[PDB]
Amino acid sequence: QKRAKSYRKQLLVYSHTFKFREPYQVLVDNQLVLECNNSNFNLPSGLKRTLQADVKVMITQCCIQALYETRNDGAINLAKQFERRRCNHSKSPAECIESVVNISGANKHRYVVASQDIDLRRKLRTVPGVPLIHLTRSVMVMEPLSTASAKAS
Amino acid sequence: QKRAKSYRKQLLVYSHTFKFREPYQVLVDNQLVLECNNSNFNLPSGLKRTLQADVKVMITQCCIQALYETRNDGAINLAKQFERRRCNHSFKDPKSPAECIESVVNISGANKHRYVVASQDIDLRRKLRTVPGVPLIHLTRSVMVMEPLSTASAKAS
Ligand SMILES: [Zn+2]
Ligand SMILES: [Zn+2]
């Protein structure tokens, strides 16, 4: 809800200064796919939620090939529901996405990229107008000390 | 470690004033188990890490019976690997998981058995902070996020 607010403001600039229009085109990388699979995160609905608009969710042939090699039969089937972006390659998932998104330092095709590869994200921020999405992992927390615990000192 | 550091200082009072000792006696409720199965989060490893010591992971019979009813075989089997905490709760004295844990942790106003409670039930958590000296643990939901606008984006505005 609260984030939907901050995001609403961010999307605006992609639409105005960058000419982005529904449905957003989102390249999903292999790591994100694995991740969402073995933690049961609905990747499709997750993107429509955060982008707050129709999204076309896609995966490059290099990313899905890499998935193929994991023989992680569960990730694979998921990737397949997505629309394939036919890259003209032969590379690593990372470089694939980079060369597809980064055309002469411009996001010519107005992709958004959802990746768990913080290395790929860093080098995409360089390119102006590239929305970046990722999944924050689950963590185990201990509540701060209660006041009743406090008063026993 | 930002946490490991913080948690270290918190455990100090539980051991100092409340006499908590490795291995920690942790009650794990049915919601937490369920969500750790669906997230593939290693519950026993998580607890061992956050408490910074070996732990005996237990679940009351009331909590596991609730799991049985969900007919979620993965969570059920996860629970089955835990030490069972026998309560004397029945068709005679029936209790929900929350009421079960509370009756077993809150003894005349004191955590007599020095349980730590790991639970996704905020209401149970709130009722337990009442009792002095009960460590509380829970899982955050993994969330999808969009990075904040990049400088390269802002500059071109
Ligand atoms: Zn490619
Ligand atoms: Zn019980």
UniProtKB/Swiss-Prot annotation, chain A:
**Could you tell me where this protein is found in the cell?**
Mitochondrion; Nucleus, Nucleolus
GO cellular-component terms in the record? mitochondrion; nucleolus; nucleoplasm; small-subunit processome
Q: Phosphoprotein: is it a keyword of this entry?
A: yes
One Gene Ontology molecular-function label: small ribosomal subunit rRNA binding
Which terms are listed as keywords in the entry?
A: Mitochondrion, Nucleus, Phosphoprotein, Ribosome biogenesis, RNA-binding, rRNA processing
**Disulfide bond recorded as keyword:** no
Q: What is the protein named?
A: rRNA-processing protein UTP23
- The gene designation is UTP23
Q: Say which residues of the entire protein are included here.
A: 3 to 159 of 254
